[PDB]
Design a protein around this ligand. Structure first.
Ligand SMILES: Nc1ncnc2c1ncn2[C@@H]1O[C@H](COP(=O)(O)OP(=O)(O)OP(=O)(O)O)[C@@H](O)[C@H]1O
Ligand SMILES: Nc1ncnc2c1ncn2[C@@H]1O[C@H](COP(=O)(O)OP(=O)(O)OP(=O)(O)O)[C@@H](O)[C@H]1O
Lengths: 373, 360
């Protein structure tokens, strides 16, 4: 039984787009917390089109902001044309979300979001996901600091784990990194091999696993240059690298009124606190929404027969422990005042390197109280 | 109370406009050159449609002309959009995987389509509404529209909890007429799968939907990957299908995985079957395979793994030829799901491996 997860670096075309989308969002929320943002980005060859709907009192040069994401990766003013066709939000959607009564907020769209957690890691995330991110996250750190030279930002990881026996085993770690023409392969493979082992030993896993380093054998042309990138085409890499289910919504470039995002975060927060409360080893939460309605239309809790108390009492504890009003859980998770660029890379979930509201175990003591009466 | 929910989107949905244009361009390429490489992405923002991606082909393709053929049927005319192309174009051992990646194949016995009830009902609802719009049996509505069907799986006979529909309408619609027409289509669909008829109906919950299409939303290729597949009941690896030729395992392996799952459940070896396949760039066979029967297996789990290995060739060039992916039209699957198409005749939906799975 082999389960596999993937991640992509800051220089991946899709992740360039996700970063530019959240960077524009962050710049909007800083000035106007009441601003509606649905920012999509196409990066095709040397053309970057910034698009979507934005209504805001904020002054934002969308193009200037794109260049600030792009120079670090590190392209210059000669590398791209960057044009904006950014429109305004539909007044038809706005009337349904922003009520006349100032006290409810209605769902930004219809949709289904999944929240997942498990006890396999301190991050309460599947091992394969954590290892795939941490690998690229360490490589990108060394590239910016020049501890790992003659590599560029574009890169991918795939970590396969053999779950046959109850103690997990690393089967394969795969890495593709964009490199310079004049790289030393010895140096390159040693650097990658060392990072792969340092990471395996961190989660005290076997160290003898198969290492697949630049399997294509040439990776100089990266980024959008041969290629295409769009906002929200890495939604499984943003979440639970499979292991969990997904409803289809992308996160980057969307303000908190888009339930696709804020409800997904809210769902992560329940799942994580349920497993942290030791009520289950794995927990998946499905939430469904209707456009303009203030509360979820349907909710499903699945503990995968890893529940350590009665399944039914877990459903009750959650209903008693969490407010499901959309304006309320948005304020509770402080989504108006959270910077989203940091989660545009290396996953939205299990960020022990960040301090995200939806990762805090501040509901464990309420779930324990409400599972018993 | 166990409530599972799936959604679908109509042909006029911005993302699905993009998926249609991407597969229409693919189809136009394969028609002339079966050896052509196509990775076509489309942005539709306000009145600008940008067609982009990589194409190597001997085929003559007016990418812009093809986009207009998808768009005119939906309402729009030559005055409604600017349509520009930035598509990068070129001329041209056995075949290795187009990329690394993970693909999931799912099947179950809940429907004749071997697909989750929530998915089938969500598609069939929009598929019937779109039919009546073109035939003018349902007037003063436009092509952009969404469905959400929630089913209560508590007891062993499934029960409709909620049907949701948003349809873009004209300024001068009659709400009485509109709500009656939707209510009637919702019931005729429920009765088709002989389900309860008393479920909750949510019709245009926003309360105004005149501004639709890419005006007041934005649309990209491959942002409806869960609506293209198993509407949340299955797992997904992250790859979108539309605009990609068969050498992209993301697509062809996903189809190959559907074909195993469906034939496994059709063979009566399980009620539900999920197949995970993992790939390495430049490798001719899958690197890992995982089989999940959700404890609904009717033979030993281990003997199902053996039967599949004996019953199917996992060479990527071989399963591409076996499923005839070079000669398959993909535009029809750009709307209303890639899987459980009893309204189409797809190679990866054929139960032509049941007798081989039983033998092995
Ligand atoms: N006034 C309105 N009332 C109701 N629905 C609307 C209105 N305006 C637009 N919509 C619908 O909202 C949809 C949003 O599409 P979609 O579900 O793709 O969300 P998104 O924010 O574009 O991101 P993603 O595609 O990742 O979900 C539009 O395509 C349209 O069908
Ligand atoms: N020589 C190479 N070897 C390995 N990987 C490469 C090579 N050249 C490019 N790549 C990687 O392959 C990627 C293209 O495939 P990828 O699956 O990442 O596409 P995507 O658009 O992100 O995904 P999807 O369309 O399935 O949502 C490039 O962005 C790059 O990261």
């Amino acid at each position: 039984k082999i389960i596999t997860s993937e991640s992509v670096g800051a220089g991946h075309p899709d992740k360039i787009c996700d970063q530019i989308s959240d960077a524009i969002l962050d710049e909007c929320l800083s000035q106007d917390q009441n601003s509606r943002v649905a920012c999509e980005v196409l990066a095709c060859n040397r053309l970057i089109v910034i698009a979507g709907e934005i209504t805001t009192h904020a002054y934002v040069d969308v193009v200037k902001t794109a260049w600030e994401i792009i120079k670090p990766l590190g392209y210059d003013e000669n590398d791209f044309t960057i044009i904006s066709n950014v429109n305004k939000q539909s007044v038809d959607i706005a009337q349904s979300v922003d009520k006349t009564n100032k006290n409810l907020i209605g769902a930004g769209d219809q949709g289904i979001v999944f929240g997942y957690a498990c006890d396999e890691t301190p991050q309460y995330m599947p091992l394969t996901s954590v290892l795939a991110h941490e690998l690229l996250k360490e490589i990108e750190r060394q590239r910016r600091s020049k501890e790992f030279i003659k590599i560029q930002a574009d890169m991918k990881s795939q970590v396969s784990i053999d779950y046959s026996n109850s103690t997990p085993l690393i089967e394969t770690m795969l890495v593709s990194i964009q490199h310079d023409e004049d790289y030393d392969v010895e140096y390159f493979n040693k650097k990658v091999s060392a990072i792969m082992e340092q990471i395996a030993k961190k989660y005290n896993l076997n160290t003898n696993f198969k290492k697949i380093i630049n399997s294509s054998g040439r990776f100089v042309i990266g980024g959008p240059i041969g290629d295409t990138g769009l906002t929200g085409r890495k939604i499984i890499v943003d979440t639970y690298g499979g292991v969990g289910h997904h409803g289809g919504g992308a996160f980057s470039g969307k303000d908190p009124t888009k339930v696709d995002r804020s409800a997904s975060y809210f769902a992560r927060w329940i799942a994580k606190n349920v497993v942290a409360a030791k009520l289950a080893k794995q927990c998946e939460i499905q939430l469904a929404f209707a456009i303009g309605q203030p509360q979820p239309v349907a909710m499903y809790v699945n503990t995968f027969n890893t529940n350590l108390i009665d399944e039914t009492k877990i459903f009750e504890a959650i209903k008693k422990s969490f407010n499901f009003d959309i304006k309320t859980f948005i304020n509770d998770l402080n989504l108006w005042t959270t910077k989203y660029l940091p989660v545009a890379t290396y996953g939205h979930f299990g960020r022990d390197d960040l301090d995200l509201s939806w990762e805090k175990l501040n509901k464990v003591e309420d779930l324990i109280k409400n599972s018993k009466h």
